[PDB]
Ligand binder design. Structure first.
Ligand SMILES: CNc1nccc2ccccc12
Lengths: 156, 39
């Protein structure tokens, strides 16, 4: 199937018609997405099959065909871009200055941008085009708005 | 049965639409991977 680096929609035919359940990143022959998009199920790419290789429900990440490859990090100062891939709509870059999720185990960057649930897995990029995390695991704040963590894995 | 479809290249777009705020929030992460607000 298609192994070209880039951003991809994750589709299913299980429900009514074809439905987009998420998005992911193909880089160095590995497909990266959020665990809640696939629940660790195998994927199809044309005539080929992609099998899960690594995953963790708590980080809410999964990689296919190989280990997690994305290691860039938000510098804590600069604006970033969400390369949003909404269901039934063209991929679009949205620039923003991330907020912060403060936890008992350290702080994480967060983007306050609201897109449909099927946009989960859309990459967040730095000025060099490097993927610093995936969008789609976050919280709903006081006024009903959505804020996603900038979720990044570890490159072994 | 899930499948993937290419949607584009991963590149920084110069002069993209700039929006969204930058909130600083206290959160907790449970064993199931769910974030919640800490007050
Ligand atoms: C409560 N869940 C959500 N609400 C709004 C937008 C979302 C985008 C991605 C993942 C989850 C989302």
């Amino acid at each position: 199937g298609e192994t070209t680096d880039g951003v991809y929609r994750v589709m299913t035919r299980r429900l009514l018609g074809s439905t987009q359940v998420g998005v992911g990143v193909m880089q160095e022959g590995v497909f990266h997405t959020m665990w809640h998009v696939t629940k660790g199920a195998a994927l199809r790419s044309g005539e080929g099959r992609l099998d899960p290789y690594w995953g963790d429900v708590k980080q809410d990440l999964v990689s296919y065909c190989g280990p997690w490859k994305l290691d860039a990090a938000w510098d804590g100062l600069s604006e970033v871009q969400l390369l949003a891939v909404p269901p039934g709509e063209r991929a679009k870059n949205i620039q923003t200055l991330p907020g912060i999720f403060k936890t008992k185990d350290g702080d994480i960057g967060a983007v306050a941008l609201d897109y449909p649930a099927g946009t989960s897995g859309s990459p967040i990029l730095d000025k060099c085009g490097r993927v610093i995390g995936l969008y789609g695991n976050g919280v709903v704040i006081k006024n009903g708005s959505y804020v996603s963590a900038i979720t990044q894995g570890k490159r072994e | 049965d899930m499948y993937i479809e290419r949607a584009g290249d991963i590149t920084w777009e110069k002069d993209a639409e700039v929006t969204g705020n930058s909130p600083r929030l206290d959160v907790a992460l449970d064993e199931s991977g769910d974030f919640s607000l800490v007050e």
